[model samples]
Target: AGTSICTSEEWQGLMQFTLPVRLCKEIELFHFDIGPFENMWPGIFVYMVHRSCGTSCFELEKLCRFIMSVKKNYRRVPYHNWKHAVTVAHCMYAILQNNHTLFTDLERKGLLIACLCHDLDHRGFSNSYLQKFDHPLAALYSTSTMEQHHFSQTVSILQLEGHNIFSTLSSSEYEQVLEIIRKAIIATDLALYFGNRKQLEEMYQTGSLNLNNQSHRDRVIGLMMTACDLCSVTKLWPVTKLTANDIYAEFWAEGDEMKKLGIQPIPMMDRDKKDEVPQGQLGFYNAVAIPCYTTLTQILPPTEPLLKACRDNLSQWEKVIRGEETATWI
Candidate 1:
């Protein structure tokens, strides 16, 4: 089945590798480096799913094909490429590992797979850019456009022959997983995060967040998706800088395209305003990243490691904003 999609040589070693027990035990402690990761990603993902969801041998083989297909579908865009997807999945895996007893098997499975599939087929352009240019995706999805498109693509891939990894599950379970995937992917739109935040925040403030409740469970899982999606910001200083450079390069490329279209790019996307990055990132940390990890930790204190890492990176960004630290991009 794998060979039908690509050459057997392309996927030869993917299924033969196993993750180190030490690495599996300390997923969060592991720092992600791009060069050392490519060969290990298939193993890591397969091992994670096998342990977390109990994939049968038949399903495991198909899952590898699905994973490779998913990876192949990602464009080689600067930041939202396959590497970013795998990293987000790794973050979700780490979080689930720490809070294993808190989530049901299905929730863990949904969160992990959602993280992998969240940004499938990204074009290195924002929803606003697509809408402004009258891109068909924008027209098809009037709101949460890119996210909706991603979810649709995920479903399409899952339906492909030799890629129906979820077919091992019962009908009810498959439907439930698909629904969770839909919610998880769509929740990644930052515009929707605020709304998800409000519900979760209200619950946290009132101290009424009962994870036993289905609605509360759904809300927390949605929030986890966003936290993992922006997981790069919570990394160490050097990794954060590299990610920022890559994403901004993509942003500036979009600006260049807009320039060709004779349209004025937004300040965030405009290369001429690249100096605003430090401040912009600081604002993002304070407004989005910090609050997200904080809220997650408040609900699940086991996730405090995530909060600490984010705060550590937040302090570095503050230094950059204050001119006390030189930015690599500048």
Candidate 2:
């Protein structure tokens, strides 16, 4: 009943208000010491962020809490739903503690906050929809790019009056907060994938690496963020399988909803009527996500198994895309 209760529409709106308030209060009461994320163990929200980071870092704690609060609000977005913010924060922690070590204390903190806030208002659809409509989100952005649109949405959520996470910071710290968020968030888009992909290919090509330029750091951050986005691959075996199913299911549901609204879904992108999930996603994982993270294991090695499982699972997807297997491959 806990899951069912949380999934209801009314409870979602109520959760939107309650979780942030409770989390804020708990932080104030404990002076932001570790505690439950909704009265449970792990205190992961705090644990993922190192103590070197500040609570007022983009009001990160608040933004993190806001994300947790919204989990009960939306039920249809599959992996982009509330559970994801925690995973995003967790992966960012992996990057900080395990990956490239060039991040200053402030850079580390800001990057974590940026990851938490990056997908705050995800609509379960891709950025193509935002572009198709003369949506205000499209107009407010400098470029009509999907990545920029997602970035602007996160920022818009941050700028909301009471929702401004950095309200408690001094002017300088606040500006740094925005800068960190901007860089970390903007770099996560797929548009940058080619440039980053080429860097990794070059590294793999060299076989013996020399560390002189900051390009190494850039590549590490880009791949880590990209891994967090393609996080299903890195999860444990069963969880990875579930997430793979979830993505296709969510897209199929979205396609069905589009049909109702008279908006045509992208061809071959829908999963509802197809005997399989999208082939393009399979191609993407093989051509993009797998190699990116595999190279990451070389450049930054914390969870090699995580990335390996990712590659293996994606191979399974490739099989399914070829109609060589069924959803039962899991």
Candidate 3:
């Protein structure tokens, strides 16, 4: 769908508007055909990001071109499926749009790029899997090498000698732009999980409005993106069900693959122990994302509705959790 152009091309004004037909096809492959992670909903997310952040049609078309390139050869399947990419992308949008007004235009632009490109070189397994395999990725990065790799890869891909998207920027502004994009993208990994939880806990405990100091704009953009990663609990019912089914199917398949490789599968990997839809949803929400965001809302007023919706979605999930609700069409 996004094939005809190069992402690095200028779309600020002189560009034609055309639907990203090829990009959409990649999304279909990742989500339904389950082809690869690189092709996942990245096109959709990029399109939405541009729209949400108020990109001009030309810019949107340019972004589509970029997404299509990544989709074509990214090999996002196995671990980094289209559904997860799209889900995270959606969450990134939710947080960016709803969070406090702290981000600068430059920072917001960087954040959008980071979120979309964060997992560019994803392998299906978690961080531990790389560590266990002595994979080069594990050696290349520190504790959060996966995340670091993503950041580094994104920069290298965009800024490598001829690849620098910011090359046109004056030297003074280039480094700052690089940093902004780097930090925004790396925040997606679980490396930030505990920190995010801490942010929420601190807010609930202090009852003070702690806006981000980084961008002079309220810096809630990053945290909101983090929150959105797990905010599927707040989605509509049918969406919730469809998302869960897709995730679980992938989870189960991964687990089986792990067994064949002689690796000890994680919790979701054990098909025998896998909970039915509603229970699994509830377990993840109540046990993980809820308390974090609930406390987030307590500290940051804007996120309260988002958190409330998350909780409400969980309540619906509880129906699915306990097998009380069924998808009317499914």
Candidate 4:
């Protein structure tokens, strides 16, 4: 609700954090985990910013400060934490590096920052849960509640001293970056993503999808954010299953609360319905994520890697649901 004040150790952990760890050669690959040398997560984020956005457009110190602030702003939630932020940004990095001509420099840079800050201060509650409880963040925004607060938190970090990474830009260019970041963060709310897909799907279907059109371009960016946000599904089955369990652990938290509130939680969120996990995963990947990336690949062929990767997992989930591969985690 208010600007976060970073503590001494929070600042100390960035520069003073002991590590000379090397990132895996497959740093941008979806299969690798950041858990091995997790201390380097912040350093890895700094490297990602440089690798994706390049060196000249940003001030190194300000960029690190902004990154540190944003990372620290994330809660210790199971799914929407700082590691998830960096992982999503890594997803974007992989996409950008493969298709450098896909977007303008401003769009590339703005999207990365937005990805990094997209889930800032997430309380591990879905937007609907917030509305059900009449949470303050819901009060702040009628729709896209967490998404709007995340953007607000992004702006709050930018306003901090030594954290204005966009300071080098002209006023107009800086505002453009802010606008891109805002839209990208809000679009991570998957509720809006449904419309973005249908609209852009028709645009592509009708041969009316013009990259030069601002609306069309922005809609594409929205889909890109969502694609990156759900990048876990695109990982190999081992990684995808691990992430699915991690996400469920978070869902179960709110499910626990809903029970306390005298309400029954959905099967996916209800720990007692554990056997239905495979069934739930089937519906999610089949309906939501698969089609999401299917639309993404149609518009951006370089994103074909992500599309195929998720489809791979959809079958993996299908196997679990069909009892083809038994897992203890399930």
Among these predicted structures, which one has the highest TM-score? Answer: 4
All candidates' lDDT scores?
A: 0.81, 0.59, 0.58, 0.84
**RMSD list, candidates in order:** 2.8, 8.1, 6.5, 2.3
Clash statistics: count for each candidate:
0, 0, 18, 0
- Sum up the clashes in candidate 1: 0
Cα lDDT of model 1 overall? 0.81
lDDT of 4 at 293: 93
List model 4 lDDT by residue over 1-330, tens digit each. 466656655555664444344554678564556656667888777666667778566876676677777877999999999889988988888877777787888888998889889999998999989999998878889999999999989999999987888888899999899999998998999999989999999999999999999989899999999999999988877878888878999999999999999999988789999999988888888778988999999998878888888889888878877889865554
TM-score of each: 0.92, 0.70, 0.74, 0.93
> Model 1: which ten-residue window has the lowest total lDDT?
1-10
- Span of ten consecutive residues with least summed lDDT in model 2: 27-36
Error of 2 at 322 (Å): 8.0
* Residue-wise C-alpha lDDT for candidate 3, range 216-275, written one tens digit per residue: 222345565566566555555565555666667667776777788798787776677765
Off by over 4 Å in 1: 1-5, 20-22, 25-35, 55-58, 326-330
At residue 88, give the lDDT of candidate 2. 68
What does the lDDT come to for candidate 3? 0.58
